[PDB]
Design a protein around this ligand. Sequence first.
Ligand SMILES: *[C@@H]1O[C@H](CO)[C@@H](O)[C@H](O)[C@H]1NC(C)=O
Ligand SMILES: N=C(N)NCc1cccc(I)c1
Length: 535
Amino acid sequence: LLSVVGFAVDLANVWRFPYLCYKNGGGAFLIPYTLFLIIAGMPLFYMELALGQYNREGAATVWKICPFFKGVGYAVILIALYVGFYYNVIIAWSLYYLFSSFTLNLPWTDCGHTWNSPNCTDPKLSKYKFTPAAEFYERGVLHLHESSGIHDIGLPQWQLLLCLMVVVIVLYFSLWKGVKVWITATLPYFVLFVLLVHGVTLPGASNGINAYLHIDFYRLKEATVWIDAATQIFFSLGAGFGVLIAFASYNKFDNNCYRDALLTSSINCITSFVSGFAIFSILGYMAHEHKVNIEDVATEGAGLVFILYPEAISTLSGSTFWAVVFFVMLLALGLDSSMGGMEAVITGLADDFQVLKRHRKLFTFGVTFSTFLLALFCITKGGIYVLTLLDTFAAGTSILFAVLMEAIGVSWFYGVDRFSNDIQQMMGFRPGLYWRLCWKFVSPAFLLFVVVVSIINFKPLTYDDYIFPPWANWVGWGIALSSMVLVPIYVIYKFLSTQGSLWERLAYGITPENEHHLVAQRDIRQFQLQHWLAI
Ligand SMILES: *[C@@H]1O[C@H](CO)[C@@H](O)[C@H](O)[C@H]1NC(C)=O
Ligand SMILES: N=C(N)NCc1cccc(I)c1
């Protein structure tokens, strides 16, 4: 019953939300987060679920309702493929930490090991990169010290190569035949609650809680926090990768997508809040232990959780049991999230091409073995730089633009009243005025604003104290545009491939393929003002 908390929690909420929150202060990130969850996240979540469940198609072939928008399905499939590259490397880190967490002297506790620089500092006898946990993550896991930047990235690390190989083999044998246990669905919440309890009882964590609950508004005057919050909203819920549409493809018709959207968004909100709470309790405790400030006590990159959660584990009694339990939780959660993403990709491209649906094993090998070879850039010596580049640009302005185009193609060109009648046929009740106003007007306007301020207010990409070269930002914007350009390219392809006059081309591009016999009789809904004045 209610296998929804095992979809409402994913590696985003527990790995990416921590550093996005910490990077943007305390609750100054939580105000835009819940705002976008109320006006944009939940409406588009419910819209994607209803679309997939009604049309019975994946992310690419759901756009037979307005053919000019299939480029958006291609774009979200490419977003998912881009995210998988650096997303399986986080699972490789999880597996390496789980393998290293089977000793009784955890390697992130003392710093008399071999991966330690002569500049270590121990609070048991600061610059937040000379601590045993940070020096284990950077030099004992990543081997980042052997890399001068993103230009000088070495060869893929051997042991991380083994971990990534295991991860990719597991993903293949999970996805090679199946169309897709509850303990791996409730263990995230158990671990998060244990961590919350210990964090609130930690010494020095009151300061972290005060810093987390403190809402500074000069940070809200700027635009970085809003773009971060929007991107995290569409990264956590999954709207923008084709995962919700591909998973609703297999739902029953009478399934209540409304209550699933409501409950998933609510669990996501409370889970992210409790996750930030635990994270900042650990951060306050770390600032107390290392005798520094909370603002410069840890990294603001993707490896923040691999320094925070080991540091909290190192305090609990029986630290090895909790290390093993936490990293099994993280590994299983990441594996489920990656199964979801790769199954979104495979379902989209297999409902699009029937030869890809017939050869499920070969196509799964092609999708998995390609994200393995391209994840070899993120497991190099300077692969944290490639992972930062991808995390910044693979799902950035791209996913916002993609969900904006989904909302537009469903609300304005397909019809929001047509979509509402579809939903009323599926479940039995019209969505409601709040939902239609968010689908048609509110969510598209906010998404357009965020995309525009994301393109016009763009900060150059940096790691902790390392500035990426300009060509790195050019490469990142090329990665972001490789998906945002699929929509106009498909519009121009579908326009230059439809026989007929200009108006017949427009009609055939905006009319669902199920009703392409109407254009012959010149009966097009979108060509009347009544269609666009439907609220
Ligand atoms: C350690 O600190 C010294 C400062 O005297 C510096 O010269 C050296 O490069 C540092 N080694 C590292 C960061 O590995
Ligand atoms: N659960 C969310 N929101 N994302 C998970 C995800 C997305 C794209 C690709 C992969 I691999 C995994």
